[PDB]
Write a protein that binds this ligand. Structure first.
Ligand SMILES: Cc1cc2nc3c(=O)[nH]c(=O)nc-3n(C[C@H](O)[C@H](O)[C@H](O)COP(=O)(O)OP(=O)(O)OC[C@H]3O[C@@H](n4cnc5c(N)ncnc54)[C@H](O)[C@@H]3O)c2cc1C
Ligand SMILES: O=C(O)CSC[C@@]1(O)OC[C@@H](O)[C@@H](O)[C@@H]1O
Length: 436
């Protein structure tokens, strides 16, 4: 019974909240408000990054899960390739996907499905890896690396610039963004007569809405009982700034990715900075409540654990050893939230009639920026196809008996899901306000 002018409220102006705002606006809605405790682009948004990988990789070997993920990935790629708003930010550089151990290579097979793509080049010798870039870039020995190179049809997007472009387009189409603290910091949803009626912000403003979308990423569990469906989990990233004289050499290189070591990208234009991530199964931040119950609580930090730095420099030694001792120009932790099987959680709430969930991006949601809003709007409108709905629906049963330490098909570092409570030392990198 929504009209196009019904008050709609989105909690979170991150990747999926912004996508939702954009798609509501495109679909004719004229009374949408988005709330976020940070200015766009949010400093705690996982999407606020100079690059993200865009590729069609799979996360399951189950036929039904593969089919649904293919549908959603095709829609996202369509956006990056064909939507004038998103095309500017996508760079089809190609992508190397690799591993080292037998367990890693098994996982690589599931992810890459090399038998389905004759275009992939198989790499098994160090010289083959070095030849992916001009002489002097990939100087390392790539010890034990084996993988598959996609020459095109995969690459990277300028995540921050795409996020900002989408928000600014939503805004010019009439979406209200209320950002910053306290005005955009939601402190509770409004619970009235067994429904959610909107939200209250930290400035003590009451925001009533006909429908509320919860798109708060790793923080979503603060607001609602997810019945153990979400595990807030964090990853680590650094930048190294190349000198102006050395930047040309590194331009246009493919994304280099080993699922047991880490990955990096060509340098950004603004600062000539290479972004590097050490791969691992993630950090939780498990706190015990007065109940004695367990929950992972996100926090902002513009540093990484020293152990993460060690893993980054180890990766660089194997690939770009000439850079392995360079000081970092930027470092941060980056949060998302994993469902029990890393499938998305996009549905109407089963009891709260007015609430729509758009979360559980499971550390792989950025690439859906162009498209995921359509699916979240479909959920509000009741238009999700049964096939897709079955995979992404509200699902407490999959999260019952939950193992919080499940590595969920990820590898690297200690091959354990770690915890920030175990971290004793952090880096000392210069602060940068990425909300600009
Ligand atoms: C290091 C790293 C690398 C990654 N690499 C890739 C990749 O290569 N490719 C890919 O596809 N994905 C990648 N991902 C995953 C991807 O970034 C996330 O899955 C995706 O961005 C999550 O989107 P989201 O909208 O759910 O959350 P976010 O974009 O994090 O947005 C959550 C929003 O909630 C807001 N919020 C928090 N508290 C409140 C509050 N109290 N009130 C209102 N709003 C609030 C926050 O300010 C934030 O803006 C990566 C993630 C990380 C951390
Ligand atoms: O979706 C992709 O193609 C890359 S996600 C990159 C990454 O850093 O995202 C965060 C976590 O899911 C990590 O395991 C993972 O390697």
């Amino acid at each position: 019974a929504v009209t196009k002018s019904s008050s709609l409220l989105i909690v979170g102006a991150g990747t999926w909240g912004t996508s939702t705002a954009l798609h509501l606006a495109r679909r004719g809605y004229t009374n949408v408000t988005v709330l976020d405790p940070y200015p766009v682009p949010s400093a705690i948004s996982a999407g606020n990054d100079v690059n993200k990988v865009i590729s069609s990789g799979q996360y399951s070997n189950n036929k039904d899960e593969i089919e649904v993920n293919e549908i959603l990935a095709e829609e996202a790629f369509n956006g990056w390739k064909n939507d004038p708003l998103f095309k500017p930010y996508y760079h089809d550089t190609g992508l190397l996907m690799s591993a080292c151990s037998q367990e890693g290579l098994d996982r690589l097979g599931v992810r890459v499905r090399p038998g389905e793509d004759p275009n992939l080049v198989e790499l098994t010798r160090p010289e083959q890896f070095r030849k992916l870039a001009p002489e002097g870039v990939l100087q390392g020995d790539f010890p034990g690396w084996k993988g598959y190179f996609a020459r095109s049809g995969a690459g990277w997007a300028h995540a921050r610039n795409a996020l900002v472009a989408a928000a600014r387009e939503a805004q010019r189409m009439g979406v209200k963004f209320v950002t910053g603290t306290p005005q955009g910091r939601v402190v509770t949803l409004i619970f009235e007569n067994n429904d959610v009626k909107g939200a209250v912000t930290a400035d003590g403003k009451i925001w009533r809405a006909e429908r509320t979308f919860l798109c708060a990423g790793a923080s979503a569990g603060q607001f609602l009982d997810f019945k153990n469906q979400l595990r807030p989990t964090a990853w680590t990233l650094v930048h190294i700034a190349l000198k102006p004289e050395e930047r040309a050499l590194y331009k246009n290189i493919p994304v280099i990715f080993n699922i047991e070591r880490g990955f990096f990208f060509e340098p950004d234009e603004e600062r000539g900075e290479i972004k590097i991530c050490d791969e691992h199964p993630g950090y939780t931040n498990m706190v015990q409540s007065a109940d004695g119950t367990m929950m992972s609580i996100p926090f902002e930090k513009t540093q990484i654990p020293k152990e993460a730095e060690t893993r980054v420099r180890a990766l660089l030694k194997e690939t770009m050893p000439q850079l392995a001792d360079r000081p970092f120009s930027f470092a941060r932790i980056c949060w998302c939230a994993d469902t029990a099987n890393r499938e998305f959680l996009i549905d109407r709430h089963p009891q709260y009639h007015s609430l729509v969930l758009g979360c559980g991006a499971s550390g792989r949601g950025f690439k859906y920026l162009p498209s995921i809003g359509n699916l979240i709007v479909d959920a509000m409108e009741g238009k999700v196809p049964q096939k897709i709905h079955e995979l992404i629906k509200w699902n407490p049963d999959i999260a019952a008996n939950r193992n919080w330490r499940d590595t969920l098909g990820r590898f690297g570092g200690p091959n354990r899901v770690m915890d920030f409570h175990d971290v004793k030392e952090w880096t000392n990198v210069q602060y940068r306000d990425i909300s600009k």
